[model samples]
Target: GASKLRAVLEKLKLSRDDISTAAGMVKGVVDHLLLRLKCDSAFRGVGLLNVKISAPNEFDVMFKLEVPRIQLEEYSNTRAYYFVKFLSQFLEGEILSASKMLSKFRKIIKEEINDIKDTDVIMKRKRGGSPAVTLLISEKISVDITLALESKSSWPASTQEGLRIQNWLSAKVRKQLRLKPFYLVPKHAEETWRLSFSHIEKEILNNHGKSKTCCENKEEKCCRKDCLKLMKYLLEQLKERFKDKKHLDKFSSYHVKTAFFHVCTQNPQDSQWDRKDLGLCFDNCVTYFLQCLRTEKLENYFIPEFNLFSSNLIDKRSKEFLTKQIEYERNNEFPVFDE
Candidate 1:
C-alpha cells in the first residue's frame, strides 16, 4: 500500500513543508491523548490513524469499528454512532482540516449524538456522568478497539492490517517501488479485552435515567424517557437470552490489540515517534493502544474485523439489515470523547 501510495503522493507534488504540517497535525492529536493514558490505565485500548488520501479514491482508511461485548446488543446503535463521531473528528483535525471535513464532522456528530439521545441510550436515575470512550492515535499508528489476531506476512510487522496494506502495496509495486504499506504490529499483552456488541448496547440502555443531561455538551443529553425504559426492559431480555453462560462466553473476553504504522518510504524513512502517543479510554477502562517502532506482526495473515468478535450465521434478511447497520456506524459521525 505504501509503495503504490507513495507514487500517487509524489504525483500530488506536495512540498516538504506541507508534509511537515500534516505530520504536525497528527502529532498534536496523538500527544494530547498520551497525556490522558498516562494518568489512567483504562484509557489504554484502541488506536487510530488519519491518512490524507487525495479525493476520488475508493475505500479510504478509517478506524475499525468496536465490537461491543455480547450482553449489550441493545446499545449497538449508540456505540456505532459514537465511534463514527470519534474517528471522523480525528480525521478532520489530524489528517485534513478542510472546510468540507469540518462541516461534515459537525453535522454528523450532532445528528448521531442527538439520535442517541432520542432513542434512550442512557438511564434516567443516574445519568450524571457522560459516558467515556477512548480513541488511541499514537505516532502515525492507530490501535483499534478490536483485538487483532496474529498473522504471518511478507511485511515487517506481521499485523493483520499490515498484511492487508502490504498486499495492496505489492499489487502496485511496479508503479511505486518506494512505497510500502504501513506496518501494523500486534501489541502483545498477557490479557485481552473484547467488547461484545450486545453488552455495550445493554449497558447504555439499562443505565438510561431521568437526571439532567450527563454530557457537558447540551445536545448530548440522553433524556429520552422511553429509551431509558426500553433499555431497562432490554437488560432483562439480554439476561434471559443469555441463560446459557457457555454460549455467551464464546463472544466475551479481552484479547491483544494490534498496532500499526503508516510511514513514508523516503530515503531516511522517518518513524516520527518523538512527536506524540495516544491511549484509548471508554466506559471506565483506559489503556495504551498504540506504540510506534515497537510492535510486531505474526506468522499468518487474516481479516482484522473478526479478531475480537465471533461471526454468526445469519439468514438473508437479518444479514441485509446488519450490513446496513455497519454502513451507518462506519459512515455516520459520532462523538469520540465524553464528559
Candidate 2:
C-alpha cells in the first residue's frame, strides 16, 4: 500500500514541454517589461529576475532593488513587518526612508507600467494589503512581482545564528550560504521590512542531500526532494479539502517548506531518505508536521524567535481542529492520495 502511495508522486512530477514553452515565453515578456522599468535611474538595477512558477500561469516573482541596506538601530514580529534600514544617500529625491520608499517606487512602477500599451499585461493592485505589484498576463496567466531589499552586511541579531542547518548541510556550506546576501520585503508599515530567505531556501532545496553525491551521480542519491514534494502535494489537497476551516486558510506551501527544513534537520543522515525507501521517509515528514500542529509552535526556520503558529497567527481551537483533521487522514492511510 505504501509503495502504491509512493507511486502517485510520479504522476505529479511531470511539467512537460508546454509548461517550459510558457515559462520561456513568459520570461521574455517580463524582461521587456523590466526594460520599461529600467527607464528611470532609480529602477535601473531593480533587477527583475527569478520567477518561481507555481504553474505556467501563476508565478511568484521575487525581485531585488539595487539599493544598499543597513540594520535598523531601533526596534520592534510575530510581527509581520520586521524592520530594516536603507541607506538614505543611495536613495534618489527626498524619498530616503524605507517606509515611504516603497510607496515612491510603487508610484513610478505603477506609472511606468501604466505607461505601457500592452492590454494583456496590466498592473493589478490586488485588494487590501498585498505588497506585490502584479502584472496580469490575461485572465489565466499572471506574474506577481514582489519588491525586496538586499542585505550584505551580516545576518541580523534576531536570527540568533542563521538556520540551524549543521546537521542537514555541512558547516562549510553554511558559512558559504551566510556569505550570500539576505533579502527584506516591504509590507503595510514603513521602515519595517519582512525578512525573506526564499533565495536561500531555493539553494538548499536544489542541493538537498546527506551526501553531496546524492542525485549528483547515478550511483548515490536520496528521495529527499521527492518526499518534500509528496508532502506538499498532499498539503495542497488538504487546503482545498478544508478550505472553509479558517485555521488552515492561511496555511500555504511556505508552511510545508519550513516543516521540510526542520524534518531534514531531524533526520539528517543520507541513509535515512534512501531513494528506494520512500514510504519510511514520507511517513517521517508527515509525523513531523503533525507534531508541529499539535504543539502550535511552527518557528520561522531563519528567525527562531518568530513562531508562525502562535495564537496571534492561529487560534488554539483552530490548530486543534486541523490537527484532528490531519490525524484522521493519516489514520485512514491518506486515501486522498488514492492508494
Candidate 3:
C-alpha cells in the first residue's frame, strides 16, 4: 500500500517544463497589469510554489498595491472584517471604494487579454464573488490573478490564536513572517474588501519543518507536502462525486490546508514527519481532518475567530454527508484516490 501510494505521488509531481510555461504566462499578465495601473504594484506567486502540490496547471498571482499609509475602521461583529480609509495623498478619497477599483482592474485585464497576439490564450471573467480574472493559457493550464492592497496595520484580534506553529518556528522566523504586510482583496461584499493572508501562508508552507533541511533539498525530505497532496486529491474527488449538490460547495481544499496547519502545531517534532513514515503521517493528517468535520468547527488558519464550518456557511445536510464519506474512505483505505 505504501509503495503504491508513493508511485501515485511520483506521477503527480509538477515537471520543470510546466513551471517554465506557468512562469512565463504569469509574467505576461503581471507586465500588462503593471503598465496599466497607476498604483505602485508588485506581483508574487502563491499556492503552487508554497504548497508543493501537483501542478493543477493553475497558479495564483497576487498583484499588490503598496499603500503609503492607511487608517482602518473595525466592524463591530468580527475583528477579521474592516473598512479602510487611505491617508496617502495619491489615493486620498478614490481608493476607499474597493468595488470601483476592482471593476477597473477587471477591465484592464480584459483589454490586455484582447491585445495578446496568440490566438490560443483564452481569457474569462470569473463571476459570482470570485476575485480572480482567469487567463486560460491552454485547455489544461490557467492563472488566477488577484488585485490586492497591502497594509501594515495590526492584525485582527481573531487571528491571535492562528499561526500556533510559530511556537515551533524560532522567534526570528516568526518575526520575519509577521513583519510582512497583510492584504485586502476586492470581492462582492458590502464591506468592499476581504482580508487576505496569501503572503504569510506561502511563507509558512515554505518554512514548515522544525529542521532547516526538511524539503529544502532532496537528501533531507519530509512527508508534509506529500500528505497535503493526498488530502487535496481525496477532497477533490469527493467534490466531483457531489458536483450536482449545492450544499457541498463550501467544503474546499482550503479547509484541508487549515486542518494541516493545526495538526503541525499540535504534533511539532521532526521525527513525527520522517519521510520513511509517509503513510502513517498521512493517516494521522486524515484523522485530524475527520475530527474537525465531526466537531463541525474548523477555524480559519489566519483568523481563529472565523469558523469555516459555521452553520451559516455550511448546511447540516452537507456536513453529515461529508462526515459519512470521510468515514467510508478511512475504513476502505481511501479507495477514492484509486479512481
Candidate 4:
C-alpha cells in the first residue's frame, strides 16, 4: 500500500516547467490588465506554491489593493467578523465598496477577453458568496484571481491564541510575521467582511519548523508537508465517494489543515518527524485528524473563536460517517489511493 501510494504521488506531481509556464502565462495577462486599469492593486502568488504540493495545474493569485488607512469594527456575534471602511480621503471618488470593485474588475476582464483574438481566457460568473473571479486559461488550467483589501491594523484578540504556536517559530520571526497585518475579503452572510489570513498562512507553511535548519538540508527533509498533502488527497477521495451525501460536502481541506496545525503545535520537535518513519508519521497525522472529526471539535486555525465542526457547519451524522470511512481506510490499507 505504501509503495502504491508513493507511485500515485509520483504521477501527481507537476514538473517545474509546468508551473513556470503556467505562472508566466497568467502573469502576462494580469500585468496587461493591471497596466490598463491603472489601479493600485498588485498580484501575489499563493496556494500550492506556498505548501509545495503536487499536481498544481491550478494557481491562486490574490489581487491586493493598497489601502493607506482603514477603519475596522468588530461584529457583535463573532470576533472573526468585521466591517471595514476607508478612513483616508486620498481616493474619495474611487470605488471603495468591495462588491463594486470586484464587479468592475470582472467587467474589465470580460472586455479584455472579448477584445483578444484567441478564446483562451474564459471568465466565470461570480458566485453568490465567493470572493474570487474564476479564470480558465487555455482550457487546461484554472486561475482563481481573488480580490483582497490589505490593512495593517493589529489582529483581533480572538486570533491571539490561534497563532501562539508561533513560539516554536522563534521570537524574532514571530514579531516579523505579526507586523504584516491581515486581509479582508468580501465574504459575508449579512454583508459583513471575514478576515483572511492566507498571507500569514503562506508564511507559516514556508517557515513551520522547530529548527531553522529543518527541511533546509537535503538529508533533513521532513514529512510534515507530505503528510498534509496526503490528508488533503484523502479528503478529496472521500468527498467524491460520498458526493450524493450532502453532509459530506461540508467537510473541506481547511478542516484537515487546521487539524494538522494543531498536531504540529502538540508535537513541535525536529526528531519527532524522522524521515525513516514517514509512513508511521503520516498515519499519526491521519489519526489526529480522525480524532478531531469523531469529537466534532476542530477549531479554525486562525480564529479560535470559530468551531469548524459546529452544528452551524456540520451535522452529527456527517461526523459519524467520516469517522467510519477513515477508520475503514486505516484498517484496510487505504484503498482510496490505490489503482
Local distance difference test values of all predictions, in order: 0.25, 0.72, 0.71, 0.71
Off by over 4 Å in 1: 1-9, 44-301, 304-339
TM-score of each: 0.20, 0.87, 0.85, 0.84
Model 4 CA deviation exceeding 4 Å by range: 1-5, 14-24, 39-57, 87-96, 244-247
Better of 3 and 4 by TM-score: 3
- Model 4: per-residue lDDT, tens digit, 1-339? 557657656755746578888878877766666665554332222112212222355666766666667777777867676766652222224324555555666776777766665547777763577777777778766777776777788777777877766546676776787778678776664545677887777776777788888899987787787777788888888888988765587777778888888887777776777766667877888899888888888888888878888777688998999999999999888988887
lDDT of 3 by residue, 153-177 (tens): 7665666666666656776876677
RMSD of each: 24.0, 3.1, 3.9, 4.0
Tens digits of per-residue lDDT for model 2 on 1-339?
Answer: 556665786666465665666666557666775777677666667775343875336667776876665655424634335545444543434334554656766676567665446545566777445567677765666777777777687777777554888887898888888888877777643445677788888888888886887788776778888887887777777777777654566666778889989999888888888877888888888888989999888878888877878887678887787788779977877877873
Winner by TM-score:
2
**Residue 272 C-alpha lDDT in model 4:** 71
Better of 1 and 2 by TM-score: 2
Better of 2 and 3 by lDDT: 2
Can you give the lDDT of residue 319 in candidate 2? 76
Q: Could you give candidate 1's per-residue lDDT for residues 1-339 as a string of tens digits?
A: 223222433544545465555445434543443444334322233344323221111111222223222111112322111111112332433222223322332243233433323222211111111121212222232222212211121222112242232322333432232232222111211111212222222222233222223333554443232212222222233333445552222211121112111111111111111111111111001111111111211111222333222222223343233234323422332111101
Give candidate 2's error at residue 212 in angstroms.
Answer: 1.5
Better of 2 and 4 by lDDT: 2
